[PDB]
């Protein structure tokens, strides 16, 4: 294949230069598990057991014993296939554009296939990270003109049936009020028997700037860490800053029994076999990726929104 497909050879050679997605920092290694699918839906079944009565004492002869029951629950997950197209120089035309220590038309913004694919893959990975964090697909800083997605396709921020808190616009700069809302949400959290787990907090730059302020010789960040430690059995609490958010705070456990990410094993960018060729030196190529696969239990994510107006 490599003897025939120069583009496949180039992809195999330059696949290592693409940086790792930053969304991996938001999950534990056990929380992520790939699935084999491109587009469609997939049903997940979770089994449980419960005790029906007090246990039976085994003495002398007895036939009536307490029972253990079972239960099941089914959750549907949707997966969507998306594609992009990019232009590049034809393989046989690179010799006519190899300049001094650089290849490609500076005037016409034409690149070799390997560099074009690397840059496009990086951009697509950034878009995938944005979708996973926010649950929406948009290329604008406002967050508008969002692409319409299927139901059962949510991010960490828009997952339904979770603890939503809202800070009024009048208290947009009152860290005491923000922390009061955070404490209320933390109290409303329901971890059950899986409370002994590390916790992850994701904030925006303005929230981090407010956090590093003194607590009204302790900081709001230290107070928040202590409060979360009071509920997570004195375990690790990680704090992260993301520019993708705007006046939002996300708190969730890094436990595979509560939140599980099951992406398609084709989620990350993959070249398409089709290449558009003509009589000129310009060709076109396609990159595929797959979105969807976040699964969570009810009342395990705290989402705080600080209204600005």
């Amino acid at each position: 294949l490599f003897d025939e497909n120069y583009y496949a050879k180039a992809v195999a050679n330059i696949i290592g230069e693409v940086k790792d997605p930053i969304m991996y920092k938001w999950f534990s290694p056990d929380q992520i598990e790939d699935v084999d699918l491109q587009m469609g839906y997939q049903k997940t079944v979770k089994w449980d057991a419960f005790l029906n009565a007090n246990p039976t004492t085994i003495a002398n002869e007895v036939n009536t014993i307490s029972t253990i029951g079972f239960s099941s629950e089914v959750v549907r997950l949707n997966y969507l296939k998306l594609q992009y197209k990019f232009r590049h120089l034809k393989q046989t035309s690179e010799k006519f554009y190899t300049s001094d220590s650089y290849i490609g038309d500076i005037n016409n913004n034409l690149l070799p296939f390997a560099q074009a694919y690397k840059l496009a893959s990086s951009e697509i990975i950034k878009l995938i990270n944005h979708f996973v964090l926010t649950g929406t697909v948009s290329i604008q800083k406002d967050g508008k003109n969002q692409k319409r997605l299927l139901p059962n396709m949510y991010g960490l921020l828009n997952m339904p049936e979770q603890i939503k808190e809202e800070v009024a616009s009048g208290d947009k700069d009152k860290m005491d009020k923000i922390f009061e809302k955070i404490e209320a949400g933390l109290s409303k959290l329901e971890l059950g028997d899986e409370f002994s787990t590390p916790m992850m907090v994701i904030v925006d730059p303005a929230t981090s700037l407010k956090l590093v302020k003194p607590y009204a010789c302790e900081k709001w960040e230290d107070v928040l860490i202590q409060t979360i430690k009071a509920i997570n059995n004195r375990e690790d609490v990680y704090i992260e800053t993301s520019n993708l958010l705007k006046h939002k705070i996300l708190i969730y456990p890094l436990n595979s029994e509560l939140i599980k990410f099951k992406p398609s094993k084709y989620m990350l960018p993959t070249p398409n076999e089709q290449v558009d060729k003509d009589s000129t030196d310009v060709a076109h190529s396609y990159i595929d990726f797959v979105l969807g696969g976040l699964l969570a239990t009810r009342k395990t994510i705290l989402q705080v929104n600080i209204k600005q107006s």
Binding site: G16, K25, P29, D34, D236
Partner: protein, 37 residues
Amino acid sequence: ASLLDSNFVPINFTEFVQAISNTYKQRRIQFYENLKR
């Protein structure tokens, strides 16, 4: 079948895509191995 293996030689585009997926999975595993918090 992984692109990180020098001796690996794909036969067709399907095997190439499988190798790409395996490479991404191995890179994720390596990232979690090297991650420090």
